[PDB]
């Protein structure tokens, strides 16, 4: 059995409901079917567990962007990235919300992950996208700002779901709304970067 | 209005630091240079004050969208809206962050503002943008999703500033970065909606 995974999943739900400071390791333990000491065998502190949870989300989010290669068809790759990001917003919204919460507080526990591994990845893949700009496979846009727009637009549907629901009546659990959302976000970003 | 303003601004800072539940009216009062009973002449409860803080940022955010009229040149109006939203992200980031925080928690106190006045505005201005779609002044996009993209892409630079800074080295207080940000967000969205 996958007790580490059960703890991570329980932690996500607890952290998302109570925040870092309000959350007690006893709450997570009980939710995951383990004792507090058992939990401490996998994660030596609440801090370590929290960082582990946010690393899970990062890996899920960044998987498609890691996969980008020079020889990929740029528009198709970016279309697919948008779709996959929206699937994450549909399937792991509480994680998206927790990551956002950490940013709102100034990234006190996650800053190192952003300045190190994230920055290095985005430099690498920005150069790759810049190469597509120079080839004329994309219109002249800044790679970093393109990336941020993908992140912001796709994560909005989870992080701002109450507002989305108030305005539209819907959520990403509605299959028709999910599809419309994918089509429109793709339409705007893709037509914005298509070479003319 | 100088005391009402001082209370609102003190409230923003206190709420941001301590959260809704941890904040006491006596903390805000002292930070604003007024007595608790003077504060209560302006705002009869902590809840009412919290909602007012978030109403300040709504009004600021929504001013350009309120101004939209049928006869406006659609691309120029949307370009300008994007710029103005980024100015707000530069100038009132802590308010953007508090509004985001309220959404992340499910909008427990702000829901009425969203279902009433906001929804009514967005319906009105979505119909107005739909009219521009039907005229051929914009490419066929969904108005609501366009609006959400403007919101998400512009608010990202405040709400996710630590990440933006980790990746780029910059903030919206850097004049060159601010200018690049405006240009690229406009480039992507405007080219995405330009009629072909
Ligand atoms: O996909 C991602 C990468 C990490 N940060 C972000 O906001 N979205
Ligand atoms: O621009 C806006 C106003 C409405 N709410 C929001 O998230 N941003």
Residue A26: strand, helix, or coil: helix
Give me the torsion for CA of A54, A58, A61, A67, rounded to 10°: -160
Q: Angle at Cα A161 formed by Cα A143 and Cα B164, nearest 5°?
A: 30
How big is the A-B interface in CB pairs under 8 Å?
Answer: 143
Domain borders along chain A are: 1-53, 54-196
| Enclosing H/E stretch for A60 | helix A46-67
**Interior/surface letters B13-45, b for 16+ CB within 10 angstroms, e for the rest:** bbbbeeebeebebebbbeebebeeeebbebbee
Which are the contacts of B190, defined by CB distance < 8 A and separation ≥ 6? A192, B75, B78, B79
| Chain B interface includes A45 (CB < 8 A) | no
The rounded distance, in Å, linking the Cα atoms of A54 and A109 is 10
Chain B residues 120-149 with CB within 8 Å of chain A: 122, 139, 141-142, 144-146, 148-149
Residue of B163, B180, B186 to mutate for A, most A C-beta atoms under 10 A: B163
* DSSP 8-state symbol, B196: -
| Chain A interface includes B17 (CB < 8 A) | no
User: Please, what sign has the CA dihedral across residues A168, A172, A177, A181?
Assistant: positive
Alpha helices in chain B (DSSP H): 2-22, 25-32, 36-42, 46-67, 74-91, 93-104, 111-113, 119-135, 143-159, 161-168, 175-193
- Residue B165 C-alpha, separation from nearest chain A C-alpha, in angstroms: 9
Identical fold, A1-53 and A54-196: no
| Alpha-carbon separation of residue A81 from A62, B42, B156 (angstroms) | 9, 49, 19
The rounded distance, in Å, linking the Cα atoms of B124 and B110 is 21
Q: Looking at domain B54-196, which CATH architecture does it have?
A: Orthogonal Bundle (1.10)
Matching CATH number, A1-53, of 1.10.10.60, 3.40.50.970, 1.10.10.410, 3.30.300.30: 1.10.10.60
Phi-psi region of A19 (alpha: psi -120 to 50; beta: other; left: phi over 0): left
Two tokens, residue B106: 């499910």
Whether A61 is in the pocket of ligand 1, judged by its Cβ within 6 Å, is: yes
Measured between CB atoms, which of A142, A152, A187 is closest to B192?
A187
**How many angstroms separate the alpha carbon of residue A162 from the centre of ligand 1?**
20
- Cβ(B122)–Cβ(B77) below 8 Å: no
| Chain B interface includes A158 (CB < 8 A) | no
The rounded distance, in Å, linking the Cα atoms of A28 and A40 is 11
- What is the maximum alpha-carbon separation in chain A? 61
- Residue B28 C-alpha, separation from nearest chain A C-alpha, in angstroms: 20
Q: Burial of A17 by CB count in 10 Å (0-12 exposed, 13-18 middle, 19+ buried)?
A: middle
User: Please, what sign has the CA dihedral across residues A156, A162, A164, A170?
Assistant: positive
The rounded distance, in Å, linking the Cα atoms of A10 and A16 is 10
């Amino acid at each position: 059995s996958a007790k580490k995974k059960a703890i991570l999943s329980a932690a996500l739900d607890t952290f998302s409901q109570f925040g870092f400071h309000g959350t007690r390791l006893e709450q997570i333990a009980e939710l995951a079917g383990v004792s507090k000491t058992n939990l401490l065998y996998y994660f030596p502190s609440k801090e370590a567990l929290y960082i582990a949870v946010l690393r899970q989300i990062l890996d899920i989010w960044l998987a498609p962007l890691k996969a980008f290669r020079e020889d990929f068809a740029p528009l198709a790759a970016i279309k697919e990235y948008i779709r996959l990001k929206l699937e994450v917003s549909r399937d792991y919204p509480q994680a998206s919300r927790l990551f956002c919460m950490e940013m709102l507080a100034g990234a006190p526990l996650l800053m190192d992950e952003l300045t190190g591994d994230l920055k290095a990845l985005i430099d690498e893949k920005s150069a790759l996208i810049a190469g597509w700009v120079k080839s004329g496979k994309l219109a002249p846009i800044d790679p970093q700002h393109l990336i941020f727009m993908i992140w912001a637009s796709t994560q909005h549907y989870a992080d701002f779901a109450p507002q989305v629901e108030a305005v539209t009546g819907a959520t990403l659990r509605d299959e028709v709304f999910f599809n419309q959302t994918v089509e429109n976000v793709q339409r705007i970003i893709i037509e914005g970067i298509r070479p003319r």
